[PDB]
A paper describes a structure:
Ferritin is the main iron storage protein in most living organisms, playing a key role in iron homeostasis and detoxification. Canonical ferritin is composed of 24 subunits, which self-assemble into a quasi-spherical nanocage with an outer diameter of ~12 nm and an interior diameter of ~8 nm. Ferritin has prominent octahedral 4-3-2 symmetry, and each ferritin molecule contains 24 C3–C4 interfaces, 12 C2 interfaces, 8 C3 interfaces, and 6 C4 interfaces, which provide several potential pathways for metal ions and small organic molecules to diffuse into its inner cavity. Thereafter, we introduced a self-assembling strategy by designing π–π stacking interactions at the shared protein interfaces involved in two different kinds of 3D protein nanocage superlattices, which is referred to as key protein interface redesign (KPIR).
In order to clarify the detailed structural features of AfFer, the crystal structure was subsequently solved at a resolution of 1.91 Å for the first time. The space group is I422, with unit-cell parameters of a = b = 116.52 Å, c = 205.62 Å, and α = β = γ. The protein subunit contains 171 amino acids and has a molecular weight of about 19.36 kDa. Notably, different from the crystal structure of other reported ferritin, AfFer exhibited a BCT lattice arrangement in its crystals. The AfFer molecule is located in the center of the hexahedron contacting with the other eight ferritin molecules located at the vertices of the hexahedron through electrostatic interactions mediated by Glu10-Asn9’/Lys120’. The C4 interface of this ferritin molecule forming the subface is perfectly aligned by virtue of Pro156, with weak van der Waals forces that provide assistance for the stability of the BCT lattice. Since only one out of three subunits constituting the C3 interface is involved in the formation of electrostatic interactions, the dislocation between the C3 interfaces of the ferritin molecules results in the lack of crystallographic three-fold symmetry; consequently, AfFer forms BCT rather than a BCC lattice. Notably, this BCT lattice differs from most reported ferritin molecules, which are packed in a FCC fashion along the C2 interface in their crystals. Also, the C4 interfaces of the AfFer forming the subface are close together, unlike the very few reported examples of BCT formed in horse spleen ferritin crystals or ferritin–MOFs. Based on the distinctive BCT arrangement of the AfFer nanocages, and the fact that the octahedral symmetry of the assembled 24-meric AfFer cage endows it with three C4 rotation axes that are perpendicular to each other, it was found that the intermolecular interactions at the C4 interface participate in the construction of both BCT and SC lattices.
Residue numbers in the entry:
A (entry chain B), B (entry chain H), C (entry chain B), D (entry chain A), E (entry chain A), F (entry chain H), ...: 3 to 169
């Protein structure tokens, strides 16, 4: 028996977070191959969102590893398909990415609060170490991308930011 | 318009195969982190099924690429959770993997037969090139693993085959 | 006598394909040096279409090699001059290239169907191996170029895509 | 006067933890040389617990350094002899190691909770940075070893795990 | 049970092809050591047909591997001795080699047609990948050797071609 | 909008800490060039406090970065001149440095307590990660320097400690 | 307007020479793959005439470049198929090559005389620099090959000269 100071509600919250990271991974996968579609043809955004999809899947696997380390049980659920089939302009897709990452961030802060209320000091620091600052940096980066995509405008500007920044 | 000799039924079959490969990826992820649970503790199988998950996700992404190359439209669906939460012995899990890969193979052979019925010579060769022989080799490897896992037996044999072969 | 399972209609079709690959080579040669003309002055497109002309000539020579390998007789015909003397905007030229490659692709699929109907298993696989997937990738690339050339627009955008992508 | 925001109960708790880490070091030293005894003769376990003894002495020294950093005073007490003179089977010893590390983990969580109740933000973070996650990983590793030692069984299994994993 | 979409007539055909490849290996071994005989003394042909014998044994082993991969059973038969004890001139032996490889090519095309009639897409592709184009190239090479051996003529020509081309 | 879980009082406290770190930077610059004055002439202390000034300016810039990352607004104020024009003995200056760093530490602990009262888990961890332990180590080092400067005494000792330790 | 001292008759003569060089390229391609036919089987001549084809295509492209550099307009015409389908002996083919190169040389000398009659000093030097001496050296080499092919004779000599000189 390795389980120690690990509440069953914290365990359920970790299972929930696993599914949300997988959901995010699959949303970015959808975004990546939308930009690979020949009617869209933005190869930098294809690469950028494919990497984001890999990173979110890494996040899901960090949480599954944590679930095992603390002596919980991983319980998987369906991965819901992304909210959209097509994602509009490059700026639209980055705006939807920012919305998703803020939603993931709120869920991580709720998970942290839950852990804190059960006195789970190791879990709180683990979430801070691997997630909370990473999420703040990702949100800042996407916000910067949105301001730049606004500045450069549609057409030539979108092509340029795709190739010179996202690629 | 890049689409040429690409049937709408073939396109839908590719979208079905994308979902099936993702389901396989998620089943192997489940298996991998089952073997990371402290009550199972088989690190070779954890590494082996984690790589199998990565490979099936690559398979899904090859099909997404092909969908775009031929001028179809990727349509994603929910990724259903794996059939089990826990996977029993190492032999049980390899047996479950064999059954899944044979299911995926029958799906690929049906997709090949469909593409052939619509005269899609490039699609047929593409499935042969990337999938049909890879699948036969995967099934042969899994069957060999099952025979070796039967030979070495439970207990010390399972530990040994996990570490010396799968890891 | 090396000839075996090689139908005389398949042989005629290979001679036809040789001439069409040479025709394509000469159309891309025309395109390349149109963009070298001082009133056009797009050096990236000059390079890009000169390479395409070399590649189509390589294709013609692969087919002549195949004709000899199977024991047929190469019969050459006039290479018709390209359809146009000048090719308009960079987007116009890439659109004409896409139209030509789809026409070449349809001819390759007809050649494959002909071979299949005569039971020429080696010829079918040879066409799949060297041509059918290459043609799908070339058609996808040109379609992507057209979407990007539309996105970036005339003037500065055309200059930029010429230098940063086609060059 | 460097002392700042450092409670004297926190300071007394750090002194208690120093003694517990030294007690753990000395328990693992006992175990290590039990496995070096000719009637036991498990060289992998000897090396593994010798390293564990070194690491626990490092932990004690980290806490002594921290006591000095915060302007407290180190106060040493007798290091109690280990609970047993001989440690049974390899599995028996890893089970006693797991019990000990859970006791040390509970002590660390109590020390953290004490620091938190006195508003010692830096001491809380220091315990998280150096101990809490290290302790969770050590406990998971020991649990995994117990599961594998059960799987391989006595005799040849014990010999094999000792040589191939612990050593 | 790894067997899937593998017809027992296909399996019996693979066993037949194994024996034919072994028969070809043994014919080329005969030829190779005929040219090593002191009354013949053509060292280039000795090396060339020894290599051909090795390659045909490799072909047999590829087919045995395939039989196992698809879940069939290898069934071996006597390897018949070669049709002749001595092989005449160098040109004579290359002519007999050409006749043999055309017979093997017809066997491979029949095996492919059989697999195709049972819907064995993977077996058809496997034969194309490993045999059909290799066989066309081997036949072209042998035909070219016969033409050059005719051109150089008997005596000094035979000596020269043996040393400079076959060797 | 990137701002999430970032309280306006926390934001104002970060602007206060930016100014305080800049004040510390400027105090250390004053000290550094006091020790460069020909009537003082302690080159080790000049180098030591110049680096301390660089480090506190880096601290201010880390907080400016954090303000932007969380979606706050940097608001700068006057940097007040240091408390003294001349700093007495080397021991006097290290004593003045210790008092300043303890003041900065109390400011950081108050900022941490404020962020904690508003549930800002990421800010709390960020202050722990970048400041709280760095501050404890800085205070410990300064206290040690003061004890050594007392031990070595004025005159030759001050010269020696300046050159051999601070420089 | 870059055009200067470039006569319209000279421009038309350059367009005529572009077509003639392309006709030569295609004649050499025909010859090259005649020698690759299994009933001819001379690999040195295949390589030699394939390179000659590449070189004449380079010649055409040099003239296209020159047309653009001087501010003319490239106008392409049909490339007539070669005069023969089969080229007889190796000596016959080199003899046909010599006659073609002398025809091309007379065309170049006529183009030079025309440029000279219009006072086009740069064009005259350009034809001298790139063509007139290259042509004399090509004709000398072909004449030497014909004398050597006469010396070595049919049969073994033709094989030897093909391999040792042309290849």
């Amino acid at each position: 028996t390795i389980r120690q100071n690990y509440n069953e509600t914290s365990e359920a919250g970790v299972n929930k977070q696993i599914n949300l990271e997988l959901y995010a991974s699959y949303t970015y996968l959808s975004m990546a191959f939308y930009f690979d579609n020949t009617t869209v043809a933005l190869p930098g955004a294809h690469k950028y969102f494919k990497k984001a999809s890999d990173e979110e899947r890494e996040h899901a696997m960090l949480l599954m590893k944590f679930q095992n380390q603390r002596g919980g049980t991983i319980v998987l659920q369906d991965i819901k398909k992304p909210e959209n089939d097509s994602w509009g302009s490059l700026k639209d897709a980055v705006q939807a990415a920012l919305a998703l990452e803020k939603h993931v961030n709120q869920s991580l802060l709720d998970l942290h609060k839950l852990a804190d209320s059960k006195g789970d000091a190791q879990m709180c620091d683990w979430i801070e170490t691997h997630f909370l600052t990473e999420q703040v940096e990702a949100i800042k980066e996407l916000g910067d991308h949105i301001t730049q995509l606004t500045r450069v405008g549609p057409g030539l500007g979108e092509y340029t930011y795709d190739k010179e920044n996202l690629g």
